[PDB]
Structure 1
Amino acid sequence: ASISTKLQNTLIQYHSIEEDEWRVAKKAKDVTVWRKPSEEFNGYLYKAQGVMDDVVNNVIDHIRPGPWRLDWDRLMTSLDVLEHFEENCCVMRYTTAGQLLNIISPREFVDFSYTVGYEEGLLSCGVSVEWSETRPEFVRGYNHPCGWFCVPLKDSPSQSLLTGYIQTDLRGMIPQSAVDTAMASTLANFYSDLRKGLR
């Protein structure tokens, strides 16, 4: 629906929030993760950013569903396309393994997915949607607006800047100290893994 236009505008909006409001959450090799109180739920909106040694198309094609999508990502354990509208409008379901010696159990997510051009690059966003089929093995997490911005690097055409905004509500019951750690590490590892998947 027109939900995609709104999802798109929300993320461009987040991408306009300037540093002043972001609080460092973790500093990795070549990835920085920040967070700020979410205006969507009682949790945080995360910002992650780092350079990728590859072009936009290749980076985004590895982030969306396909051949080796579960292959490089240590946290995703399954991925299903449930409803496909336009080539760039999906409704997917994916599960996530347990984290922190099981302090966080396997999650399930059913998100709307939308990929569109952004500047000279691309925007691949999403938000969770209502889905009845439930499974006891997985607690359903809920993703508020989130997305990945990927655009060519300044004056380096062979590279690109990958910026992500993640606003996940893992639901269930987890102490905030574990949630904080988990989310910060999930984003940092996503870049490590993604860089390996690109090979």
Structure 2
Amino acid sequence: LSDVASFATKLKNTLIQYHSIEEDKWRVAKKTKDVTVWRKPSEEFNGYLYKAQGVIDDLVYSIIDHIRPGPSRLDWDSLMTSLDILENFEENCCVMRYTTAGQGGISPREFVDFSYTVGYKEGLLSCGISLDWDEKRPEFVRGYNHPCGWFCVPLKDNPNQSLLTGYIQTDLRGMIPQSAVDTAMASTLTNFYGDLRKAL
């Protein structure tokens, strides 16, 4: 990165734009009794942007501390098998690398992502996007995260709880039926909420 501030500002604004997309652009992909996942075509690659929403029985600052790159995230997130900080820019901005266990016959991926955590209304946004990175490790497929992130705000009807909204936009690469991508993305999102709720 040549200009970290400009990059972070563009990423944050992209996520705020996603959070403004109207409901007729979304199609339901998976619905459980306390998480919903929607999908729409991505403007960033040949695949899809996913949105997840669900309530968390905690307040915003501790939730985002659990989600942002750090030891807590690696501990409770069952799909994540490693987490490294590659470069720090500020207290709230870094480049990190994380790896995922395989699922649905898709082999382990690694992602090298810019990460940025910032205030948003009465809550917080933790957003990310993949970056170019030289360390090529044959043990992992380098997947690519297009703009993604987590909004966490007080639940409008009960602010002792929080509303957690996620956007994920991952290119897993390789030959994978979109059905298996769909299942992986929706299962990853619902297990994310499940694991986070149990961590708190």
Q: TM-score, normalised by structure 2?
A: 0.96
Moved more, 173-182 or 9-18: 173-182
**Secondary structure at 2:132 match in 1:** coil
Q: What residue is the counterpart of 2:65 in the other structure?
A: 61
- After TM superposition, the structure 1 = structure 2 runs for residues 33-182 of structure 1, keeping only pairs within 5 Å, are 33-100=37-104, 103-182=105-184
Moved more, 172-181 or 16-25: 172-181
Partners of 2:14 and 2:182 lie apart in 1 by: 23
Partners of 1:54 and 1:125 lie apart in 2 by: 20
| 1:155 Cα deviation from its structure 2 partner | 4.2
Size of the alignment, in residue pairs?
196
Aligned residues of 1:77 and 1:97 also touching (Cα < 8 A): yes
Letter in 2 for 1:120: E
Q: What residue is the counterpart of 1:191 in the other structure?
A: 193
**Secondary structure at 2:21 match in 1:** coil
Partners of 1:68 and 1:124 lie apart in 2 by: 15
| 1:175 Cα deviation from its structure 2 partner | 1.5
Aligned residues of 1:27 and 1:33 also touching (Cα < 8 A): yes
| 1:150 Cα deviation from its structure 2 partner | 0.4
| 1:67 Cα deviation from its structure 2 partner | 3.0
Letter in 1 for 2:176: I
Aligned residues of 1:139 and 1:172 also touching (Cα < 8 A): no
Partners of 1:177 and 1:16 lie apart in 2 by: 27
Give the ranges of 4+ consecutive aligned residues of structure 1 lying more than 3 Å apart after TM superposition.
Answer: none
Partners of 1:45 and 1:155 lie apart in 2 by: 27
Gaps of 5+ in 2: none
| 1:193 Cα deviation from its structure 2 partner | 0.7
Letter in 2 for 1:118: Y
Letter in 1 for 2:23: E
Give identity over the alignment, percent.
86
**Secondary structure at 1:157 match in 2:** coil
Q: TM-score, normalised by structure 1?
A: 0.96
